[PDB]
Design an enzyme around this catalytic site. Sequence first.
Site, PDB file in Angstrom:
ATOM      1  N   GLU A 113       0.917  -1.122   0.009  1.00 15.12           N
ATOM      2  CA  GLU A 113       0.028  -0.006  -0.039  1.00 15.12           C
ATOM      3  C   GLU A 113       0.887   1.305   0.052  1.00 15.12           C
ATOM      4  O   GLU A 113       0.769   2.136  -0.859  1.00 15.12           O
ATOM      5  CB  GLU A 113      -1.049   0.077   1.257  1.00 15.12           C
ATOM      6  CG  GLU A 113      -1.998   1.190   1.113  1.00 15.12           C
ATOM      7  CD  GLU A 113      -2.230   1.481   2.412  1.00 15.12           C
ATOM      8  OE1 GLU A 113      -3.294   0.657   2.965  1.00 15.12           O
ATOM      9  OE2 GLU A 113      -2.104   2.625   3.147  1.00 15.12           O
ATOM     10  N   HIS A 114       1.759   1.251   0.776  1.00 13.17           N
ATOM     11  CA  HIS A 114       3.041   2.305   0.956  1.00 13.17           C
ATOM     12  C   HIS A 114       3.256   2.671  -0.388  1.00 13.17           C
ATOM     13  O   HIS A 114       3.349   3.839  -1.019  1.00 13.17           O
ATOM     14  CB  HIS A 114       3.822   2.124   1.951  1.00 13.17           C
ATOM     15  CG  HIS A 114       3.520   2.469   3.328  1.00 13.17           C
ATOM     16  ND1 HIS A 114       3.966   3.634   3.882  1.00 13.17           N
ATOM     17  CD2 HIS A 114       2.520   1.992   3.996  1.00 13.17           C
ATOM     18  CE1 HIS A 114       3.306   3.575   5.091  1.00 13.17           C
ATOM     19  NE2 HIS A 114       2.486   2.681   5.341  1.00 13.17           N
TER      20      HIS A 114
ATOM     21  N   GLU B 299       4.755   4.781  11.844  1.00 17.46           N
ATOM     22  CA  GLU B 299       3.157   4.599  12.007  1.00 17.46           C
ATOM     23  C   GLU B 299       2.854   3.649  12.931  1.00 17.46           C
ATOM     24  O   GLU B 299       2.031   3.674  13.802  1.00 17.46           O
ATOM     25  CB  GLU B 299       2.549   4.075  10.316  1.00 17.46           C
ATOM     26  CG  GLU B 299       2.758   5.433   9.431  1.00 17.46           C
ATOM     27  CD  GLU B 299       2.346   5.057   8.056  1.00 17.46           C
ATOM     28  OE1 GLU B 299       2.547   5.945   7.031  1.00 17.46           O
ATOM     29  OE2 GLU B 299       2.073   3.844   7.911  1.00 17.46           O
TER      30      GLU B 299
END
Lengths: 446, 49, 57, 49, 423
Positions: A60-61, A137
């Site tokens: 996703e990153h 994160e």
Amino acid sequence: TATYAQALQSVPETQVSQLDNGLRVASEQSSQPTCTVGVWIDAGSRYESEKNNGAGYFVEHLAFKGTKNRPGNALEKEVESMGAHLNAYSTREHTAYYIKALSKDLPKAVELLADIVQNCSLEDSQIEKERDVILQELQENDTSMRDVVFNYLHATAFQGTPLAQSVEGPSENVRKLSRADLTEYLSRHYKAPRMVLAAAGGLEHRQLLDLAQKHFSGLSGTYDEDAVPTLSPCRFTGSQICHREDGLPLAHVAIAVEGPGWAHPDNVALQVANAIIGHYDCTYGGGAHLSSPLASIAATNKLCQSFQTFNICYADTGLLGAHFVCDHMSIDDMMFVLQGQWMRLCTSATESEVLRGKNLLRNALVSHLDGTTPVCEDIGRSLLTYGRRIPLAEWESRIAEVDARVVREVCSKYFYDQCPAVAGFGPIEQLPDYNRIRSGMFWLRF
Amino acid sequence: SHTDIKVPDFSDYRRPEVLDSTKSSKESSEARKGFSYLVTATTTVGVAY
Amino acid sequence: MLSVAARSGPFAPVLSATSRGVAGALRPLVQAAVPATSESPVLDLKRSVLCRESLRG
Amino acid sequence: MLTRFLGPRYRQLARNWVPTAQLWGAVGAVGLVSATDSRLILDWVPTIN
Amino acid sequence: VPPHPQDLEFTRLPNGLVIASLENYAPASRIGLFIKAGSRYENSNNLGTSHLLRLASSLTTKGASSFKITRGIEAVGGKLSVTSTRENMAYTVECLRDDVDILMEFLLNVTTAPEFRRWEVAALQPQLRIDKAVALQNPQAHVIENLHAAAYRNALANSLYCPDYRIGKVTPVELHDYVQNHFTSARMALIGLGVSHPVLKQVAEQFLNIRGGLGLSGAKAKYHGGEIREQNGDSLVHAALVAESAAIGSAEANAFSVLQHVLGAGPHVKRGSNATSSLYQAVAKGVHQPFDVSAFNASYSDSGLFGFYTISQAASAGDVIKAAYNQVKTIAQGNLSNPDVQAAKNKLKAGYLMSVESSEGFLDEVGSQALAAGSYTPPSTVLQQIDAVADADVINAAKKFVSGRKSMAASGNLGHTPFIDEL
């Protein structure tokens, strides 16, 4: 003036069409000048090993950081220059990438989505910047007591199954995941019969089809065969994890019994029962007069700061129950009241409240499908889990059929005398002992 | 980082009917509650005597 | 193109009976979550975000 | 005087507790019988004399 | 095959009330009563009265007790929510079609027959503190509240949140006065979604014929400028630099909106570098890492605040702010493209259309329009309005920002946050 019932029939049928791939392409045409296009994929973390875990979250990153036709930052420059918005998400069982954009822009939006979902440039230099970003994160998510409790809950309920894992993965996996690890996970999961291109708004279904053949032709066709496994069930355990930490000022607790998966028809009755119990928060107006007894008793005696019931769904299992937040001396009363409602509903649910539930649910459903984005999301998800798009009229029929008898029958089946999965964090000295929580799941009156 | 949070294996403590991650537990539940409750029922019958 | 709040920027609070107290117009934050270390409480003397009265089945 | 307890819901409440209350009384009945034997209330079935 | 739509029907009653409704054949309905009653109509003697009011939407009304409001709405699963901004107060109510009538009634009772009983208002006071504490945990809400206090000497300076010294002191008579004089026909708008025009029009002529309050949009916001600074130790400094711009509805406002998009509002891509954002690239170039920037743009009935907002480590605040300010200067000195304004136009238009995609979004947009303009301006003409903005209009707004007496609010460890003097 049309009735509510009549209005349900008016919502245009969601049109479904399949490509020679396995790629399903579905749309719900409205009249809006804006739209939402996206790719929903049957890839999560429930599909990952242990050494691997964090794989999708890591993709996703990298997903919007460059493709082979659009390098480092060109993708961004295109999405932005047309005023579109590109977002994405990942759960334990689903991954999605969607573009929110103007209707004329549909051709480019699909084109872009294709490029991202197929020709991704996981360039070494970038995968290395993302490891630092992901670790931060993880540090950030640790400060969110709520996210933590739900991960704890998952980790204890699903103990030794792939469902016990988190989406982001363990920190050690974040720093060791290689390009090869990511490329293999993409190969194994990002394949046509496991993806659905969905859209909603000012589009004609033929546009979507044309665009899907034009830009997605090139997946599964010459592919599939051996190396395509299914999903194994995940044993629910029912236990408890307590993370005592008196430094934090409010306790978080999440308790749930095993629910049935997506497919099961009895999710409607569970949601009705959950709606009756409802939710509360310290900024709701109306305290003492709220219908929900838990809500009411919580607000008057101030037994909490917030609470919410939930019915989370996965393949053939789920977590059904509630979560709450409160001062150290209210964990016991809060639990007592919580459990009080489950049994009451298991045994003596009454007709009026069931109608309130049904009505709360009709409003939640309709209120939520308002806007191209939620609708688009709904099409994509549904096809992955239901294989169909369930028209509002059907959900209405399913809600309509629920009466008190159903509620007390369906709650009993999942709640009555079953072991819960409990998860606690914060000042939890007074979180009740497991046995006591277990002993509050049944009642001696009954 | 709270993601490093394990959950120690309990195979060494779990009843047999619940040893497989591969399958449900809803099945052996009845048998499990059955057994544990039969034990307490039989006991009360005993004490009652 | 009125609607001051949605013209983005000035603040707009909401109170509710069933939903939750909101405070939410425009200024940055979103691209401080990216270049990161933008913490947050989670649930320090608070309420709850995302809010409810949305669902499905 | 004391009758705010009349209405659809209260009626509904009562019916949900009927199978239970009936079953409960039977417990106590069989209980009293067995406690003082089949002369001091309720004789009959496979038990001696 | 979606059904062919419907047009919004609009009607100004002679008493000044406006009524607007769209019949989208939706399963749900939405009704909102928009009232020009925001915090800007409060004064030195009654600050906070609009907050407590906002929190009192479910106290007993003639015709409907608290218990009824709460139980009646929840029985059909509807909502009653009230939302305020410095200019308006909007009561919206939502529920399935079949239930508009009862929700309509509760709405009318809350907005036109509140009783504000002494004891009920007394029990509600502490909510101001819980409500306020929850909003104030976002550093933004402090700053923006301090920004307005600093920029205006008058009306828009008022806070949207009750000042601490008033918690517990706003009186039932002060609420009655606030309602009798601001909740009147000529300052109101009844918008509907999922209802029919005759019904709204009927409801309006029967129940919303109230008048004897005040008159227009203000005492008049006198912009003055100055700066408020709140030492904090949050590791992150929040700062907002702003100048007077233009009132909503004026052509110039649109220029500012376009400038906001040339500079940079929110993000479009999750975890993105924000390439098309002039401010961001400008700060990023000389500042290495945790930081955020965005143009800030607020426009009201008789004034406007435009500029930018920054979030950054305590020691980099000065640098972040100075780079941001210099970026604006660059635009004000003529260094603006044409595809940039074009991209901005596209970012703004796409965003507006997006903002009215849903009911909640559409409705608020229609209500505010009714109050601000007394008209309903279709998406076609708003897009046309945006297109008329020329490159020079954009340049001219930047030039207006660069030379106007400034206003600033900042919170955090301010040790390296400059003072305006030093900008």
